[PDB]
Amino acid sequence: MKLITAIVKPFTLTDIKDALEQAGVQGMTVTETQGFTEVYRAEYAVDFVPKVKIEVIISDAQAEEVINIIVETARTGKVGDGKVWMTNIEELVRVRTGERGEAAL
Amino acid sequence: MKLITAIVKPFTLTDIKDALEQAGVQGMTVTETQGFFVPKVKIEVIISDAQAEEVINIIVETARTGKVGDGKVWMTNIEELVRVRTGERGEAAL
Amino acid sequence: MKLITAIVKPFTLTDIKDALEQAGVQGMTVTETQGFEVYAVDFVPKVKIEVIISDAQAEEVINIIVETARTGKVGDGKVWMTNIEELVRVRTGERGEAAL
Amino acid sequence: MKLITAIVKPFTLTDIKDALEQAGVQGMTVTETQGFVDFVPKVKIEVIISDAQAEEVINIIVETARTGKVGDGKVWMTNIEELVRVRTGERGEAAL
Amino acid sequence: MKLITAIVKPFTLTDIKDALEQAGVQGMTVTETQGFTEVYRAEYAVDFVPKVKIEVIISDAQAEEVINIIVETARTGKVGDGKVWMTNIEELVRVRTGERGEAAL
Amino acid sequence: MKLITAIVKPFTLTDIKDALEQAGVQGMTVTETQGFHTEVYREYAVDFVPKVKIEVIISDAQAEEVINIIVETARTGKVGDGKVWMTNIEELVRVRTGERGEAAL
Ligand SMILES: Nc1ncnc2c1ncn2[C@@H]1O[C@H](COP(=O)(O)OP(=O)(O)O)[C@@H](O)[C@H]1O
Ligand SMILES: Nc1ncnc2c1ncn2[C@@H]1O[C@H](COP(=O)(O)O)[C@@H](O)[C@H]1O
Ligand SMILES: *P(=O)(O)OC[C@H]1O[C@@H](n2cnc3c(N)ncnc32)[C@@H](O)[C@@H]1O
Ligand SMILES: *P(=O)(O)OC[C@H]1O[C@@H](n2cnc3c(N)ncnc32)[C@@H](O)[C@@H]1O
Ligand SMILES: *P(=O)(O)OC[C@H]1O[C@@H](n2cnc3c(N)ncnc32)[C@@H](O)[C@@H]1O
C-alpha cells in the first residue's frame, strides 16, 4: 500500500479529482496549506502562497498511475506548480468494517 | 518508531483522545481536513513499535459508527525522531 | 530522499524558515494544527512544517529545525523523518534529485 | 432587515440549525472562530431575517445554545440597510 | 461610510476583485465560511457548502455601485449564488496614521 | 452597545489582547482572514496577506477607548497595518443567563 501526497495550486483541485475519478480512483483527503519579511518587536515572513495538500491511499499497482494523473493535471507550466511524493504504508485498516491491507483499500 | 494517522468523523475526537490517554498515549496532533464537502479530522500519533498495533485498534474501535464515512487508519515508518526541548532521540524522544 | 516533518510552536516559524533558507534549503510547507464539557474545550495552536530533503542533507535539516524551534519549555514539539520513495516536480515531471 | 450574529459552542450548531429550520428560517452561514496561547473554538452563526422575525430568531438561538456553563456566548443584532439576492437582484424584503 | 458584506461562491472571487479594482475600489477582506445528518451518542449535520465572505469598506457615494458590481459579478443564475448587504459604519480609523473618515479610505 | 472590528497583522494579536486586558476590557472573538499577482488557468489571484479579524462588543462609553487601544497597539508604521471600525449593536443577549443590553456586556 502507498500514500500519494501532492502539494498543488488550489484551483487545480476540481480537475485533479475528476481525472482520478475517471481512472476509477476514489478516495482522497484534502487539506489547506501554505508555502512561502517584516520586523515587529522579531522578524516575520509576511507573504504566503495558498496550496492544497491532496492525499490518496492507493494499491502498489496503481501508485504510479495516480502520480502521473496528478502531475499531468496539476501542471500549468508556471513556477510553483508543486510536488508529488510517495511514502510506504505498512498497515491499513478500514474503520467501519475492520478490513485490513488490500481489503481496506 | 511508527506514525499512526487516522481520518475520522469530527465528533469521535474526544472519545478517541480519552481512549488513548487511558492507554498511556499522550501526544496527539489534530488537523481539520475534508474528503471524498464532508469535514473530517486527521489524528496523528507517534508511538513505539511495541504499542503501534494497540494504538491502531483503539482508534479503529473508538472511531467506528458502522456508517459510511468512518475513515481509515494507517501506519508509516519513522526513521528518526527528536524531541525538540531535550534533543533526545529514538525511544528516548517518545 | 526524505520528508522531515516538525510540530512546533507558531512563533518559531520565521526563525526556522530563515535558518533553513540560510542553509540553502527552500520549499517548506506550513499547516496550522493543534494539540490538546458534556452535551475537550482547550486546544494548543501548533504549526506542522514539512521539508523535502536529500538523504545527504537530512540530518542537518533535522538539527537546524530542532535548534531553531527550541525554547526549553514544555510543548516545544518533535521532529521526525520518513522515507520518500518517489518525488516528482509537477512542472516538468522530473524525478529524484532533479525535482529538488 | 436585521443581521443576527451569535458566537456559540461548536457542538450546539446542529441543534440551532434544526430549531431555526422548524421556525421557517433558512440560510445561515457558519464560520469557525475562537475567543477569550490557548484558544477555545467557537462558531459564529449569521442569519439575515425580517424585522418582524428578528426577536424570535434571537430567542431560538439563545435557548438552543444555552448550556448554563461559562462559554455559552452572546447573540447580537445589527441593522441591515440594504439587502440584495445575488441570483435574482431582488432587494429588501423580496431578497429575504 | 458603509460596510458591504457578501457571501458568494468561491470561484467568483477573482472576478469580483478585478471588477472592484477597475472601479478604483481596493481593500477587500476575504474569509472562508460555510453554508448548509448523523446521530452519535447527538445530531450532527453531515456536509457543508463552501462559501467566501467578502467585506469592503466604502464611502456612501460609492456604496450602491459597489453593491451592483458585486451582485452582477458574483451571479451565475444558479441557486446558492448568495446575498449582498450594507451596514452602517459609525467610525473608520486607519491604523497606520490614526486618520478617520474619508482620510482612512 | 457597539461592535468594534479590527483587521490587523496577526503578529500584533497578543499585544492587542494584553493592552485591552490591562484596560479592563475582557471578551474578544478572533477570526483568521485574508487581504490581497495574477495567474491564468483554464483569472486567479495568488498572493494573499494573512490578517486576523478582532471583534469586541463594548459599551458606548468605552467604544472610543477600545478603538484607540487597538489602533495604537496594532500600529507598526508600515503599510498594511489595517483598519478599525465601529458598528451599532441594537440588541445584545448573554446566552448563559438571558441577560440583555448593558447587563449582557
Ligand atoms: N484512498 C484514500 N486516500 C486518502 N484519504 C481517504 C481515502 N479513502 C478515504 N479517505 C478519507 O476518509 C474519509 C472517509 O472515507 P470513506 O468512509 O471511504 O468515504 P465515503 O463515506 O465517501 O465512502 C474521507 O472523507 C477521506 O478523507
Ligand atoms: N465582548 C465580546 N466581544 C466579542 N466576542 C465576545 C465578547 N464576549 C464574549 N465573546 C465571545 O463569546 C465566547 C464565550 O465567552 P463567554 O460566554 O463570555 O465565556 C468568547 O470566547 C468570545 O468568542
Ligand atoms: P476557478 O474554476 O474560477 O476556481 C475554482 C476554485 O479555485 C479555488 N480558488 C478560487 N480562487 C482562488 C485564488 N485566488 N487562489 C487560489 N485558489 C483559488 C476555489 O476557491 C474555487 O472554487
Ligand atoms: P457533540 O458533542 O455535539 O460533538 C462535539 C464536536 O463535534 C464536532 N462537530 C460538531 N458539529 C459537527 C458537524 N455538523 N459536522 C461534523 N462535525 C461536527 C465539533 O464541531 C464539536 O466540538
Ligand atoms: P512573534 O512574537 O514571533 O509571533 C507572534 C505570533 O504571530 C503569529 N505569526 C507567526 N508567524 C507569522 C508570520 N510569518 N506571519 C504572520 N503572522 C505570524 C503567530 O503564529 C505567533 O505566535
Residue numbers in the entry:
A (entry chain E), E (entry chain A): 1 to 36, 43 to 47, 49 to 112
B (entry chain F): 1 to 36, 55 to 112
C (entry chain D): 1 to 36, 44 to 46, 52 to 112
D (entry chain C): 1 to 36, 53 to 112
F (entry chain B): 1 to 36, 42 to 47, 50 to 112
What text does the study give?
PII proteins are ubiquitous signaling proteins that are involved in the regulation of the nitrogen/carbon balance in bacteria, archaea, and some plants and algae. Signal transduction via PII proteins is modulated by effector molecules and post-translational modifications in the PII T-loop. In the present study, crystal structures of the PII protein GlnK from Corynebacterium glutamicum have been determined, namely of adenylylated GlnK (adGlnK) and unmodified unadenylylated GlnK (unGlnK). The allosteric signal that links effector binding to the regulation of the activity of PII-interacting proteins is primarily transduced via the T-loop, which adopts different conformations depending on the nature and combination of bound effectors.
The protein crystallized in the trigonal space group P32 and the final model contains six proteins chains per asymmetric unit. However, only three adenylyl moieties could be modeled with confidence in the adGlnK structure. Hence, only a single AMP moiety was modeled per two Tyr51 residues at each special position, namely the moiety that displayed the most easily interpretable electron density. This observation suggests that in the crystal, at any given point in time three adenylylated tyrosine residues are able to adopt defined conformations, while the other three residues are forced to adopt flexible conformations. While four of these sites appear to be devoid of any ligand, fortuitous binding of AMP and ADP was observed in the remaining two binding sites. In both the AMP- and ADP-binding sites, the adenine nucleobase is bound via two hydrogen bonds to the backbone of Ile64 from strand β3 and via one hydrogen bond to the side chain of Thr29 displayed from strand β2. Of the six T-loops present in the six PII monomers in the asymmetric unit of the adGlnK crystals, a considerably higher number of T-loop residues could be modeled in those loops in which the adenylylated Tyr51 residues are clearly resolved, and a considerably lower number of T-loop residues are visible in the two monomers where the effector-binding site is occupied by either AMP or ADP. In addition, the presence or absence of ligands, whether it be phosphate ions, AMP or ADP, appears to have little effect on the conformation of the T-loop in the present structures. This also holds true for the adenylylation of Tyr51, which also does not appear to affect the conformation of the T-loop. Interestingly, in both adenylylated GlnK and uridylylated GlnB, post-translational modification of the PII protein does not engender defined conformational rearrangements in the respective PII protein, hinting that complex formation is not modulated by an allosteric mechanism but that rather direct atomic interactions between the adenylylated Tyr51 of adGlnK and AmtR as well as between the uridylylated Tyr51 of GlnB and ATase promote complex formation.
